Design a protein around this ligand. Structure first.
Ligand code: 8M6
Length: 126
């Protein structure tokens, strides 16, 4: 079975709108989301449909861009670092679970390179 996905809203978790979080949705997430390599990362890993019975025995902090997108759209994050951490968790999980040099890793590596380039250009808080 798959676990429940990571939450994307929480009525008790404070929220605000900041220009850095606006940038993470409009520039960073959008650039990665539309990239030709985005698709394996656009939703939680479906260990059932993908026949990966050991995925959630190895990965206990799953994360994916579908979750990140919803968190941004739902004002789930208070700050940019929370979102950056989620992207990093996504990439790290990929590099832990998959064999080095596999295509999925090369795909993540290409997305991470773009990610780091866009994060280097994070605007200062207004
Ligand atoms: C984010 C992330 O880490 N994941 C989500 C996406 C993903 C995996 S693992 C995986 N395998 C395939 S291939 C079928 C397979 O080999 N399953 C399998 C069975 C028994 C043992 N190990 C394996 C791998 N495909 C389809 C595909 C896309 C390009 C190449 O292949 C995938 O999208 C994924 C994990």
């Amino acid at each position: 079975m798959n676990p429940p996905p990571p939450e994307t809203s929480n009525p008790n978790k404070p929220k605000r709108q900041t220009n850095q979080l606006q940038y993470l949705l409009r520039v960073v997430l959008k650039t990665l989301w539309k990239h030709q390599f985005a698709w394996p990362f656009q939703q939680p890993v479906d260990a059932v449909k993908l026949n990966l019975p050991d995925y959630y025995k190895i990965i206990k902090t799953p994360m994916d861009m579908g979750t990140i997108k919803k968190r941004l759209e739902n004002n789930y994050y208070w700050n940019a670092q929370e979102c950056i951490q989620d992207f990093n968790t996504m990439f790290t999980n990929c590099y832990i679970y998959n064999k080095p040099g596999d295509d999925i890793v090369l795909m993540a590596e290409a997305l991470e390179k773009l990610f780091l380039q866009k994060i280097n250009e994070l605007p200062t808080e207004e």
